[PDB]
Ligand binder design. Structure first.
Ligand SMILES: Nc1ncnc2c1ncn2[C@@H]1O[C@H](COS(=O)(=O)NC(=O)c2csc(-c3nc4ccc(O)cc4s3)n2)[C@@H](O)[C@H]1O
Length: 532
């Protein structure tokens, strides 16, 4: 039992009611404080207040209700990050309609797969994503209505959220007398998120309202989240359609924070925005740390108010993290680790309990352990195995896929992450890598991160994978973005014999990786397999 790591009691208690009720209540309070800003588009320098956000979301909620949407229905939200993104999200949560965000850069096959799973009756989509939706809806007769998110007028023959609302709301509708729907928060689905899909096509991850309600505890937790304090602004550059961006942003709204967003990253827009908006917290993914590592523009700006930079969703090398923290005059980088299937982060760096390299400690309400791959036995301190976690943010299941659900989550509620991890004498957790990413040369384990960090030492980017053999099983190899034998012999001079770059090198102009910064191990393997 000493080998089960447990979250402590929460510093902010779990709240009663559906996630919709909790968001409604908080945002109505902020709405009544004049000038409170909920979202800011840093690209166009436009703000929207809580009063405006609250009022439009409630109008969208009532309209959707009058349209006939209820807990038997799903909507899709398909959009890049924007001021409008969370309007249909909140509207739907207020009335118990399940929300299925669809990645806005999905190709048509991926997009069709996602909506085939969520089976939406109504699709909310940005101007930019509209055509992809049209290109696949023929195969999805479930869809009865398409609404454009980021237009005020009708747009290409489709209603916008504004004209939709106006065609279903009484003109004398009072937003402040609206009452959100009450329902069973364990049974009623809040979100249907898409999984990563290592085993192929993504799945639909169903998240009861309860898991959002537990997130809101973590979010308001002064130690595992961010204490509610007026005039707090966050700069977020994380995709809203992904678990990382979805449940941080809903938390920030519950906290009454100003969420400063950007539809795409640019170094200077980011840095000026930190300054001019007096940002207290920047929420990043690891891939962006490259730009900030070399400094450049940083020390020009007044970042007096920056308290923390938080990373998640992918590995962050200890070196880069420490380097970037130093430049920003921060003690370190705050981490969070989670999976779509755990709703949000369930390992988080507690305030004042930092340890370089660690992704943090088990959050309140949760437990974690690491197990033997061969027998499933619980392992002890410093022993690497598969990270398993359990707690009330674990998904209720993959939509219409009970087999995959049971393959992931066992009878005691443990979710099997597919990550190799260990914990230390103080209960800090370290992520080694995805198990499927590990390289096995003649029986010995080789972790790509160590070879990558070593290749990064040479005076731009790189990805390490296992080139198959026949005797060795795999040989450590790398694709490298420049700023072969020169690299190979350099590596062999930094590591032990078992983890030398016998696989070779393949030069590319870009290392394949996902939105949140996870390397595409499969694509990198194909690149090496073709070349060498
Ligand atoms: N911090 C991390 N370090 C190393 N690896 C990390 C990681 N986080 C996710 N991963 C990897 O992503 C995989 C899952 O990817 S995923 O399914 O797309 N889902 C996610 O990546 C995911 C879902 S929720 C979430 C986070 N929420 C947060 C809230 C606050 C905060 O400060 C930090 C975070 S991260 N991440 C994991 O299995 C793991 O391999």
């Amino acid at each position: 039992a000493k080998n089960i790591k447990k979250g402590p009691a929460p510093f902010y208690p779990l709240e009663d009611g559906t996630a919709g009720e909790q968001l409604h209540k908080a945002m109505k309070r902020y709405a009544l404080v004049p000038g409170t800003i909920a979202f800011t588009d840093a690209h166009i320098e436009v703000n929207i207040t809580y009063a405006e956000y609250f009022e439009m979301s409630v109008r969208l909620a009532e309209a959707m209700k009058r349209y006939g949407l209820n807990t038997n229905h799903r909507i899709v939200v398909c959009s890049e990050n924007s001021l409008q993104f969370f309007m249909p999200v909140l509207g739907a949560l207020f009335i118990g309609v399940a929300v299925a965000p669809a990645n806005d850069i999905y190709n048509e096959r991926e997009l069709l797969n996602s909506m085939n799973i969520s089976q939406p009756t109504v699709v909310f989509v940005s101007k930019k994503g509209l055509q992809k939706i049209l290109n696949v809806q023929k195969k999805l007769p479930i869809i009865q209505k398409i609404i454009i998110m980021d237009s005020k007028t009708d747009y290409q023959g489709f209603q916008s959220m504004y004209t939709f609302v106006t065609s279903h709301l009484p003109p004398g509708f009072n937003e402040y007398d609206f009452v959100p729907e009450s329902f069973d928060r364990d049974k009623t689905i809040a979100l249907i998120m898409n999984s990563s899909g290592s085993t192929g096509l993504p799945k639909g991850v169903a998240l009861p309202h309860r898991t959002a309600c537990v997130r809101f505890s973590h979010a308001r937790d002064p130690i595992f989240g961010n204490q509610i304090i007026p005039d707090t602004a966050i700069l977020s550059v994380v995709p809203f359609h992904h678990g990382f961006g979805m449940f941080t942003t809903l938390g920030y709204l519950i906290c009454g924070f100003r969420v400063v967003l950007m539809y795409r990253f640019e170094e200077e827009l980011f840095l000026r925005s930190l300054q001019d908006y007096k940002i207290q917290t920047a929420l990043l993914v690891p891939t962006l740390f490259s730009f900030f590592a070399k400094s450049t523009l940083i020390d020009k700006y007044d970042l007096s108010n920056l308290h923390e930079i938080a990373s998640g969703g992918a590995p962050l090398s200890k070196e880069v993290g420490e380097a970037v923290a130093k430049r920003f005059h921060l003690p370190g980088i705050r981490q969070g680790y989670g999976l779509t299937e755990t709703t949000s982060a369930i390992l988080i760096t507690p305030e004042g309990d930092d340890k370089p390299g660690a992704v943090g400690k088990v959050v309140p309400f949760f437990e974690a352990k690491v197990v033997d791959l061969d027998t499933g036995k619980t392992l002890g301190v410093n022993q690497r195995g598969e990270l398993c976690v359990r707690g009330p943010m674990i998904m209720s299941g993959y939509v219409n896929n009970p087999e995959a659900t049971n393959a992931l989550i066992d009878k005691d509620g443990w979710l099997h992450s597919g990550d190799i991890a260990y914990w230390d004498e103080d209960e800090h957790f370290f992520i080694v890598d995805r198990l499927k990413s590990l390289i096995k040369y003649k029986g010995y384990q080789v972790a790509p991160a160590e070879l990558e960090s070593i290749l990064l030492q040479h005076p731009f980017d790189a990805g390490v994978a296992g080139l198959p053999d026949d005797d060795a099983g795999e040989l450590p190899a790398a694709v490298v973005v420049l700023e072969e034998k020169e690299i190979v012999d350099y590596v062999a001079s930094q590591v032990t014999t078992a983890k030398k770059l016998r696989g070779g090198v393949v030069f590319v102009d870009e290392v394949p990786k996902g939105l949140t910064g996870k390397l595409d191990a499969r694509k990198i393997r194909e690149i090496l397999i073709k070349a060498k």
